[PDB]
């Protein structure tokens, strides 16, 4: 936890698991405020044996710790090894939700957005829909770094990347979010040749790893 001096307190544990349960190698984690209770919390996209995806959420306790996780979303239609989850408020609800960037065998990729909602008193992520897509070979998911945020300040989170092009050029793209969580076309920003900015030699400051 943080103090008013800008320093951190001693760490304390909360949620835990016995060995043989949660495997670190199968955990892709993101964070955000997924139920709008004013506290950020964790969610995990777990690789369920057959490489299906099951999403857990770990609500934050009032004391800063974490509570027992629950499943908010699951699908067997997509390969866990090809999913890179991201978190943010992509429709301006006041409560964060997630999208998954998917790298298809076809060489194309897409983003599927699952908006957070409460139905019959139960918190879960809604049905996934495609909000972004590209032609095959247009983007390589392993050659670009991702970071989300509200770049135009319109109250809806969106995502931007620094991608490494075939000719070594690095280019910024931003896809802003529409009121329905559909993305707009990418808008080009700053770019440079490899002689100035080396892609593989820089790491962005993020809110969650990878």
């Amino acid at each position: 936890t943080s103090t008013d001096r800008g320093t951190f307190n001693a760490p304390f544990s909360s949620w835990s698991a016995p060995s043989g349960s949660w495997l670190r190698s199968r955990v892709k984690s993101v964070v955000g405020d997924f139920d709008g209770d004013g506290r950020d919390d964790l969610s995990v996209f777990y690789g369920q044996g057959d490489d299906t995806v099951k999403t857990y959420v770990f609500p934050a306790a009032p004391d800063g710790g974490f509570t027992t996780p629950a499943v908010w979303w699951q699908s067997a239609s997509l390969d866990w090894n090809r999913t890179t989850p991201h978190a943010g408020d992509f429709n301006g609800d006041g409560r964060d939700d997630t999208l998954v960037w998917y790298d298809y065998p076809d060489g194309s990729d897409k983003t599927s957005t699952m908006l957070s909602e409460r139905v019959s008193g139960k918190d879960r992520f809604g049905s996934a829909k495609v909000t972004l897509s590209s032609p095959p070979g247009n983007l390589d998911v392993t050659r670009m770094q991702f970071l989300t945020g509200d770049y135009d300040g319109d109250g809806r989170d969106d995502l931007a990347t620094l991608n490494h092009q075939a000719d070594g050029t690095v280019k910024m793209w931003t896809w802003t979010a529409r009121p329905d969580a559909m993305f707009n076309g990418g808008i080009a920003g700053w770019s440079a040749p490899a002689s100035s900015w080396v892609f593989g030699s820089a790491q962005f400051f993020t809110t969650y790893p990878k």
């Binding site: 239609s77 997509l78 298809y104 076809d106 897409k110 495609v130 897509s133």
Partner: protein, 232 residues
């Protein structure tokens, strides 16, 4: 389908109302004929002057008035070329007026189908229920509802496309009754699990084949982003 003494060729429903006409009234002695060219026309008393035509071409074809409702001109290959459109959609009792029905899920787990019959002033009367079944008979979590005349009876039927917990799919059909109610659903089609999935299917009812019986088309969205239209 009748040709009146006043020369006006008309189609009327079981309600006694006229659904379609050529408007060739006052031409007394006028006659309606189906030509060798495959078209249906109305000719004047002189046997020469044409007052109305479907303006179709289909040698070796025929004009058939279907039990489903409307009048359709078909070619030698059995393909429709023209139709008057004199039909009443989802008319469940066959009285010549469209009706509507709903699947009502009770909080106690049981369900039934309720039918609202059309009145003479276009209003909808109080519903009657039919096919009231006990709790546990249907697992009503993942099902889609269709209407249409799936038997060629002349009265509307209903159908339900449902997924099952084993990922299998079945399509149920229930025939319309003369009293406005429905009989028990029966399986009209089914597939083993791994074939079709209820989450991807988006069924539509209507007569797509033009064979005089309603059928089902599905806009199937694949997980890989591809799309296909399937017809049953």
């Amino acid at each position: 389908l009748t040709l009146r003494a006043d020369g006006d060729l008309v189609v009327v429903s079981n309600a006694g109302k006229t659904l379609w006409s050529t408007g060739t009234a006052g031409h007394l002695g006028a006659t309606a004929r189906f030509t060798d060219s495959g078209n249906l026309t109305v000719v004047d008393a002189d046997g020469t002057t044409v007052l109305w035509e479907s303006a179709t071409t289909a040698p070796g074809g025929s004009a058939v008035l279907q039990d489903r409702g409307d009048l359709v001109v078909r070619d030698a290959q059995g393909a429709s070329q023209w139709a008057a459109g004199t039909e009443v959609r989802h008319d469940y009792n066959g009285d010549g007026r469209s009706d509507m029905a709903a699947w009502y899920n009770y909080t106690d787990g049981r369900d039934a189908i309720h039918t609202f019959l059309g009145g003479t002033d276009g209003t909808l009367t109080k519903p009657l229920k039919s096919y009231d079944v006990a709790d546990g008979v249907w697992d009503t979590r993942a099902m889609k509802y269709l209407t249409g005349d799936f038997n060629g009876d002349g009265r509307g039927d209903t159908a339900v496309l449902k997924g099952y917990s084993d990922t299998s799919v079945k399509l149920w059909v229930a025939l319309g009754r003369a009293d406005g109610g429905f009989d028990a659903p029966y399986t009209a089609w089914s597939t083993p699990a791994g074939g079709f999935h209820i989450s991807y299917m988006t069924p539509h009812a209507g007569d797509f084949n033009g064979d005089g019986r309603d059928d089902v088309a599905v806009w199937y969205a694949y997980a890989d982003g591809s799309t296909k239209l399937w017809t049953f």
